[PDB]
């Protein structure tokens, strides 16, 4: 991932936070020269084993995902293949009108974590079930409404033969936190102020992240 | 793009619409077997000279983008290479507690357009400057606050040698509009109703899309 130094994650935990808050990744592997790469949007969770052995920069951590086994990308997920998982968080277009500075150019503030690693296909029926149930339980607790899977565990087992589950061992993770760090403090405050007053949560989230980046040229 | 039949764009114009509102694409090309694919977030516009604005049918359309020429992906972007541009729109986790049905599994409603095409590198500095000026002007009208670049056109010339601009001639465009179409009408209404009341606009945006649609995912 190409990241100018002033847009790198302010601390490694920001990557963890973004991955956990936006776990529907784009999973990308090389394809043929004529087809281009494969890409599938699919849910990713940290492997619960990694919680007790957490690496600061996520290197060597294990993530889990699944996809449809009818999806052509599944046939290509050979164990040992390199994979990219791209997670995106809040973002918003920045009008130069908020800068109060001339000259200037517009830009887009945005947040992204690119994780690279090696795929291992999961074939076991029980381990596949462990993946989808841990994904269901983690997402429901974080984003849901106290739904109880207990009456649907047998339902999961009925449909689990269709699941293509896989593990990613992380070889690198990098954050792009493009939040006006190139601008003077007075200029970032003006954008952040304008973004807070929008009321559209995505703008508010972007403003909150820009406020937590310490004082550190793009465009 | 792998898309179950019931999640495909109901009309080609939905894809243009999504790209229009979320033009910061993830631009992806193949890499080496050891590196994995290249991926860069960058802004995409229709070529004003040809396509001009967004058409229902994107096949054969000409798009333009740019990235930093110092970005390793620029070196690998040979003219004639295939590229993927992935655009994402609104999305939201769906708790089964909204279904009122047992058993069930959770899911994530989301929207995505994958555009594939053939790359042509732009080398003229004036044409490169044309690309970024058209991008800034288009985005400012759509997302900004009436900022006038006139006093910054000389600033653009100063920094434009760093711009790697490129054209994509589109060979295919496919939409993933995952909006609970696998669920019965009463269930879709109930999820959509809940998304309207959340107050996070991303949820409202997802609800508005579910309302526009008149199947065995997780079934
Ligand atoms: C909890 C959050 C979950 C999310 C967000 C989620 C999301 C998804 C997505 C987006 C796909 C399509 C992948 C592709 O395009 O290749 C998929 C596939 C699939 N998932 Fe999940 N899933 C979740 C949990 C579960 C659970 C608990 C099960 C139970 C076994 C399950 C079973 C399946 C199956 C069978 C498929 C492939 C066939 C189909 O789409 O029905 N998933 N999932
Ligand atoms: C709304 C309008 C624009 C947006 C959203 C935008 C966005 C971006 C992004 C995301 C990158 C990073 C690409 C990478 O990671 O490799 C970039 C690079 C660049 N953009 Fe633009 N751009 C816009 C307009 C312009 C204009 C008008 C110019 C004037 C020349 C310009 C000059 C550059 C340059 C020189 C770079 C490479 C070096 C750097 O990032 O500072 N951009 N732009």
CA distance B56 to chain A (A): 23
Q: Which atom of ligand 1 is nearest to the CA of A136?
A: 1
Q: Quote the Cα angle for B131-B64-B41, to 5°.
A: 105
Beta bridge mates, A25? A42
Alpha carbon dihedral A125, A131, A135, A141, in 10-degree steps, equals: 90
Answer whether A145's CB lies under 8 Å from A117's CB: no
- What is the Å distance from ligand 1's center to B91 Cα? 15
Helix (H, G, I), strand (E, B) or coil at A35: coil
Q: Which atom of ligand 2 is nearest to the CA of B74?
A: 16
Beta bridge mates, A28? A39, A84
- Looking at the CA of A26, which ligand is closest? 1
Q: Which two tokens stand for residue B77?
A: 């972007």
Helix (H, G, I), strand (E, B) or coil at A109: strand
Instruction: Answer whether the bond into residue B206 is a cis peptide, omega within 30°.
Output: no
Pick from A163, A159, A19: nearest CA to A77: A163
Whole-angstrom distance, CA of residue A26 vs CA of residue A18: 14
Closest B-chain CA to A32: B30
Instruction: Establish, for the pair of chains A and B, how many residue pairs have beta carbons separated by less than 8 Å.
Output: 167
- Find how far residue B13's CA is from the centre of its chain: 13
| Ligand 1 pocket, residue A137 CB under 6 Å | no
CB contact under 8 A, B97 and A70: no
Enter the resolution in angstroms. Answer: 2.1
CB contact under 8 A, B105 and A34: no
The DSSP call for residue A102 is S
- Chain B, window 112-151: residues with a beta carbon less than 8 angstroms from a chain A beta carbon: 112, 114, 116, 132, 136, 139-140, 143-147, 149, 151
Alpha carbon separation from A72 to A37, A185, B24 (Å, rounded): 12, 48, 26
Q: Which two tokens stand for residue A179?
A: 């939040």
Whole-angstrom distance, CA of residue A71 vs CA of residue A84: 17
CB contact under 8 A, B199 and A200: no
Pick from A12, A5, A16: nearest CA to A181: A5
Helix (H, G, I), strand (E, B) or coil at A161: helix
- What is the Å distance from ligand 1's center to B85 Cα? 24
Asked how this structure was determined, the answer is X-ray
Alpha carbon dihedral B42, B201, B180, B39, in 10-degree steps, equals: 10
Whole-angstrom distance, CA of residue B70 vs CA of residue B163: 9
Pick from B118, B46, B38: nearest CA to B78: B118
CATH superfamily of A5-211: Electron Transport, Fmn-binding Protein; Chain A (2.30.110.10)
| Ligand 2 pocket, residue B141 CB under 6 Å | no
Question: Looking at beta carbons, which residues of chain A come within 8 Å of B110?
Answer: 24, 41
CATH architecture for residues B5-210: Roll (2.30)
CA distance A167 to chain B (A): 16
| Ligand 1 pocket, residue A62 CB under 6 Å | no
Q: Is B219 on the interface with A (CB under 8 A)?
A: yes
- Chain A, window 170-189: residues with a beta carbon less than 8 angstroms from a chain B beta carbon: 176
Q: Quote the Cα angle for A132-A38-B69, to 5°.
A: 125
Residues 6+ apart with CB under 8 A from B118: B80, B81, B82, B83, B168, B169, B171
- What is the Å distance from ligand 2's center to A218 Cα? 8
Rounded to a whole number of angstroms, the CA Rg of chain B reads: 20
Instruction: Answer whether the bond into residue A103 is a cis peptide, omega within 30°.
Output: yes
Whole-angstrom distance, CA of residue A3 vs CA of residue B42: 13
Q: How many residues does chain A have?
A: 219
Place of tokens 């599944």: A74
3-state secondary structure chain B: CCCCHHHECCCHHHHHHHHHHCCEEEEEECCCCCCCCEEEEEEEEECCCCCCCCCCCCCCCEEEEEEECCCHHHHHCCCCCEEEEEEEEEEEEECHHHCCCCCCCCEEEEEEEEEEEEEEECCCHHHHHHHHHHHHHHHHHHHCCCCCHHHHHHHHHHHHHHEEEEEEEEEEEEEEEECCCCCCHHHHHHHHHHHHHCCCHHHHHHHHHHCCCCCCCCC
Question: Looking at beta carbons, which residues of chain B come within 8 Å of A24?
Answer: 91, 108, 110
Whole-angstrom distance, CA of residue A1 vs CA of residue A88: 14
**Domain residue extents for chain A:** 5-211
The string of DSSP letters for A119-157 reads EEEE--HHHHHHHHHHHHHHHHHHHS----GGGGHHHHH
Place of tokens 């732009």: B122
Rounded to a whole number of angstroms, the CA Rg of chain A reads: 20
Alpha carbon separation from A148 to A21, A79, B95 (Å, rounded): 21, 34, 10
Closest B-chain CA to A100: B147
CB contact under 8 A, B104 and A155: yes
Whole-angstrom distance, CA of residue A55 vs CA of residue B46: 43
């Amino acid at each position: 991932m190409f990241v100018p130094s002033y847009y790198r994650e302010p601390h490694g935990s920001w990557m963890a936070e973004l991955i956990r808050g936006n776990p529907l990744a784009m999973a990308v592997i090389n394809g043929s020269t004529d087809d281009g790469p494969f890409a599938t949007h699919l849910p990713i969770i940290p492997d619960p084993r990694t919680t007790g052995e957490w690496p600061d920069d996520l290197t060597g951590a294990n993530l889990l995902g699944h996809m449809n086994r009818a999806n052509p990308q599944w046939q290509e997920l050979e164990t040992g293949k390199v994979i990219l998982l791209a997670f995106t968080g809040p973002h918003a277009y920045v009008s130069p009108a908020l800068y109060g500075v001339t000259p200037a150019a517009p830009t887009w503030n945005f947040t992204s974590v690119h994780v690279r690693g090696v795929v291992e296909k999961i074939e076991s029926l029980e381990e596949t079930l462990d993946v989808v149930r841990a994904t269901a339980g983690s997402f429901e607790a974080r984003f849901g409404d106290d739904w109880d899977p207990s009456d649907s565990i047998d339902y999961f087992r009925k449909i689990v033969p269709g699941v293509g589950a896989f593990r990613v061992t992380v070889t690198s993770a990098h954050g792009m936190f493009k939040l006006s760090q190139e601008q003077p403090a007075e200029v970032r405050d003006r954008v952040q102020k304008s973004f807070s007053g929008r009321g559209c949560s995505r703008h508010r989230e972007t403003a909150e992240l820009m406020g937590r980046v310490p004082q550190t040229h793009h465009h």
